[PDB]
Curated annotation (Swiss-Prot), chain B:
The lineage of its organism: Archaea, Methanobacteriati, Methanobacteriota, Thermococci, Thermococcales. The gene is dph2. PANTHER family: 2-(3-AMINO-3-CARBOXYPROPYL)HISTIDINE SYNTHASE SUBUNIT 1, DIPHTHAMIDE BIOSYNTHESIS PROTEIN. It comes from Pyrococcus horikoshii (strain ATCC 700860 / DSM 12428 / JCM 9974 / NBRC 100139 / OT-3). This is 2-(3-amino-3-carboxypropyl)histidine synthase. One of its GO terms (biological process) is S-adenosylmethionine catabolic process. Binds 1 [4Fe-4S] cluster per subunit. The cluster is coordinated with 3 cysteines and an exchangeable S-adenosyl-L-methionine. Pathway: Protein modification; peptidyl-diphthamide biosynthesis.
Amino acid sequence: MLHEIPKSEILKELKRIGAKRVLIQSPEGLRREAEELAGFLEENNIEVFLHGEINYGACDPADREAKLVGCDALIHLGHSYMKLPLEVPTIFVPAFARVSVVEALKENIGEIKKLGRKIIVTTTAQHIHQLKEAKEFLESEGFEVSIGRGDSRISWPGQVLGCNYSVAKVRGEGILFIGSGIFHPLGLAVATRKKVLAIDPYTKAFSWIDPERFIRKRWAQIAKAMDAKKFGVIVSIKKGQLRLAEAKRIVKLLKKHGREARLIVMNDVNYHKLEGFPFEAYVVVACPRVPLDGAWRKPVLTPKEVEILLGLREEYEFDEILGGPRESDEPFGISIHST
Amino acid sequence: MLHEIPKSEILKELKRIGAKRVLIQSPEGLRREAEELAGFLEENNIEVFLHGEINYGACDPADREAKLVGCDALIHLGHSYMKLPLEVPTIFVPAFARVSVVEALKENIGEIKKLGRKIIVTTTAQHIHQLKEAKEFLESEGFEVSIGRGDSRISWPGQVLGCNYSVAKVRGEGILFIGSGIFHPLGLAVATRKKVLAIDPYTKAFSWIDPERFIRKRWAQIAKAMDAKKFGVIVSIKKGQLRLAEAKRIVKLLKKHGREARLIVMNDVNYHKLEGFPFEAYVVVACPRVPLDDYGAWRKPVLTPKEVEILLGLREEYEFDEILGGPRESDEPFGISIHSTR
């Protein structure tokens, strides 16, 4: 149950823009929402194309596609804006979960107290609108609450992304993560070297994160790759994912240590498509989620990991795509940007 | 010369261009050859990137991608040029199979005679260089051989593509097809309604194509869509597959006949990506191989545009959906070509 799509506000925005034809991208959970929204906008004399790709982030706006098919503007359902060049005017429609964060915290006060007095609090987009309540509740429980602004890849203070934990690079004794899954909490534990407690607002369940099992698991992939001679080094052309210079660097670095390395260019980074190439191992220089989150035949490493493989790095490190300083914050609802 | 990758010629055309960084596209069977060529070119001071996607035709050059990552040119392995605008100079490197086709013809000369005196001869790209021998042989046995030039999506006279049988639209009693597999000769028969005899040059086996089983399958699929009210109308942004105006027509048509219709824009067209959408049936206006050659992956009724018109009761007889080009002024070489726009 999400906060409902603001069809009205959206339409008012197109009207202003003087947009006649639009493309709508949507994530897996919002497909039916996407069409419903389309019918409505066509009822009001606007032509709507739907994007057929399942979208996974604002790091991947379908603006170039919009341009190609002659669209005036892009609607991006389900995510907030991260700083990118956009080729047509784009309306972002953050989706906010309705579930009560504070109820989930109230059931777990005792666990949260094991974190310390001054704590760092983090969450995901789906809960960012209740972070102020969550902070006020925690302060009313005796905690000092530390929340980081984050960099240009982040939309709001306290928000973490799979590739980015800059909001957690602040002073504090322990880290509270509000949301589901163990990937972010794990990412936080490794990136900060702090104790991490994760609370799932849906289930009210909690997890104390231990990164050592993960780090050991990664080290076995690094070990397998120790004897590899031939590497493929992968980039993604997604607007917010391309990391050419870094991939070039990794290529040069593997060669200098007597390996062969070839840069490979993809869109969706997908092991399957690579099975015929002659390479013995892979380095993904895109979004950390791909390799870290373990079913590929050959080893696949992040750029940090390959630095360890070549013994130019000693401690394990999570791969993050960092942004630049962020001027202001995004709104808790619709926003529109253009270039 | 002709049957392996001409590293030196490729290197020579890159030099002439002044290309210092190239992107190499390859299909499934040439993944290893792609990297061997990359290694060779890098030994010669050209920076090489590989395209990680799996390519399925010259209708989908990775020239925009080449541009985005700073490449001077694109190498396109395994296919020959079809008329498209290109953002970087592109070297095409078509694949030519080695098998001599005549032996298989000699074996089956009897069956070929049942096509009549004047016959239409067709093949696929990988035997195109053998077409001259085949013609000379058939004539020496008394046939009259007609070979169509085909339109701008075809690279050589006599060559068929899965979505284009234009080389077959010429005067002739019956059609001979030299090659393997069932999709092409079946496409020929459906698209020309003429007698088609298929001969595989490897096995020397022959087959007379009966499209009855295929067309009946297509009526069934149309039957299933007769109930649908919500329609997804699909285009692909691959350079040589983008049929926007025709997709818009089909949307307008569907609505005009009471159905709901939405235009959906993809790159690679496949059902799984569409599973969460509300539509009860789909129209693919792109590469007809998708709906016409589905092994079973589409769990909702998926149609070609031709088949939509039949459903709304605007057609009476089945027609194969082809992607057609315009007049082609010249022919591609039997070897590498290089093309540009910008």
